[PDB]
Design a protein around this ligand. Structure first.
Ligand SMILES: O=C1CN(c2c(O)cc(-c3c[nH]c(C(=O)NC4CCCCCC4)n3)cc2F)S(=O)(=O)N1
Length: 283
């Protein structure tokens, strides 16, 4: 019907809820996702650059650190040509790879970092503290960068930090928008579709995903579950601009050719449908 662009997805959603097919649908996606080479991730010299041995970027889509003796970072370039959307999905940096993370942000001309995890979750560190929390500058001498906190905007479910990234050697500075969603549990879902959508709209409204910036850097802990959920919702909502009925299963499988394991639970998949539907209604 005319005023209901979400109609076909909403009909799918109710159909999958009624037949309780979220778990089998999720298994279909897992079964139909195919492996791709990830040899560089497994080189012995990169062992301490990977947070999890199980989560590796594919060789054909890894982001390379330029002008580096070792060019490896656990980060994947995920692009969806039909949507003209590109993202870098990456793990939460380790203490020894925070310098590589900022070098990547600089070289890729990234304007926004979307962080979907807490530093500490369930008595485990999921990500190093890679930006400063007070007025003291954080120095990454390995790669020649310093980060300063410029401002902090704390809301109920997320915080926005404005960071000043400076190339120490060149003297150039750039302001990075650090969008920190703080109420999304590991392997879980956000507090509500509404709270997630306000966060996503804030990222969109900022201008940080404009084509004249490099791709935004999206991360959680491993960079696949929450990062993949966030990416799928934004991408599908962009695809909906063209007015065709969209196949969410296929969009996700296509995204999974760029980075393994995007969306980690049947409930994250179900949340994805819900946020696309409620997001289309909001718009
Ligand atoms: O919703 C989400 C979920 N995420 C997420 C994540 O947190 C972790 C992992 C992962 C993959 N391998 C291992 C791993 O070997 N852990 C070992 C286990 C036994 C030894 C002691 C602790 C260390 N952990 C995969 C993910 F998808 S996410 O991608 O951050 N977003």
């Amino acid at each position: 019907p005319l005023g209901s662009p979400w109609g076909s997805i909403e009909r799918e959603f109710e159909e999958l809820d009624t037949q309780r097919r979220w778990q089998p649908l999720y298994l279909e996606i897992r079964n139909e996702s195919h492996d791709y080479p990830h040899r560089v991730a497994k080189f012995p010299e990169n062992r301490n650059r990977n947070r999890y041995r199980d989560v590796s970027p594919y060789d054909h889509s890894r982001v390379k650190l330029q002008n580096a003796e070792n060019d490896y970072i656990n980060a994947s370039l995920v692009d969806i040509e039909e949507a003209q959307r590109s993202y870098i999905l990456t793990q939460g940096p380790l203490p020894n790879t925070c310098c590589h993370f900022w070098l990547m942000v600089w070289q890729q001309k990234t304007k926004a970092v979307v962080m979907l995890n807490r530093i500490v979750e369930k008595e485990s560190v999921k990500c190093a503290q890679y930006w400063p929390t007070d007025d003291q500058e954080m120095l990454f001498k390995e790669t020649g960068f310093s980060v300063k906190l410029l401002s902090e905007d704390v809301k109920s479910y997320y915080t926005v930090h404005l960071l000043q990234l400076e190339n120490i050697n060149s003297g150039e500075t750039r302001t990075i928008s650090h969008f920190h969603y703080t109420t999304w549990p590991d392997f879980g879902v956000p507090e509500s579709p509404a709270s997630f959508l306000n966060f996503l709209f804030k990222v969109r409204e900022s201008g940080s995903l404009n084509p004249d910036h490099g791709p935004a850097v999206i991360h959680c802990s491993a960079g696949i579950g929450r990062s993949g959920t966030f990416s799928l919702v934004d991408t599908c909502l962009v695809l909906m601009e063209k007015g065709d009925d969209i196949n969410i299963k296929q969009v996700l499988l296509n995204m999974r050719k760029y980075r393994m394991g995007l969306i980690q639970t049947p409930d994250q998949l179900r949340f994805s449908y819900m946020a696309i539907i409620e997001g289309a209604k909001c718009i």
